[PDB]
């Protein structure tokens with residue numbers, strides 16, 4: 001049972017690279033642009049943010065699984081350890097990505113925070 005209040009704090013480990021900004025430009029969490037905006041990520045098609053330059057592996061996940069979206073379960077796994085998640089979904093041990101950051105605790109909490117800011121999932 002993820003706690004979005006705890007997740008908001010844990011998101012300080014994500015905001016160097018990611019923002020959470022609503023479609024009207026309102027910052028929920030002011031953050032970087034190295035990774036894509038995470039507002040609305042829960043239920044969002046994998047690797048589908050307009051203009052973002054994704055790595056080959058995550059694009060392959062989306063290409064080979066056209067109906068795939070970010071579920072809460074997949075988010076928890078990916079946040080925990082991104083690379084093996086990509087290997088799992090692509091079936092390719094050499095799946096690319098420069099994104100290896102692993103969150104070691106409170107993963108369901110951060111995902112609850114992301115879900116709070118995906119009001120239309």
Ligand code: HEC
Pocket residue numbers: 011013014015016017018034035036038041045046047048049053054055056057058075078079096097098099101103110
């Ligand atoms: C920079 C060093 C990052 C940190 C710290 C975190 N993320 Fe990240 N994220 C980053 C990049 C460059 C990418 C693109 C990956 C690729 O291979 O192209 C991502 C992607 C995500 C995604 C997928 C988004 C999508 O639109 O499909 C998610 C859900 C995500 N990142 C979440 C996330 C969280 C919760 C983090 C803190 C725990 C976090 N990331 C850290 C770069 C960086």
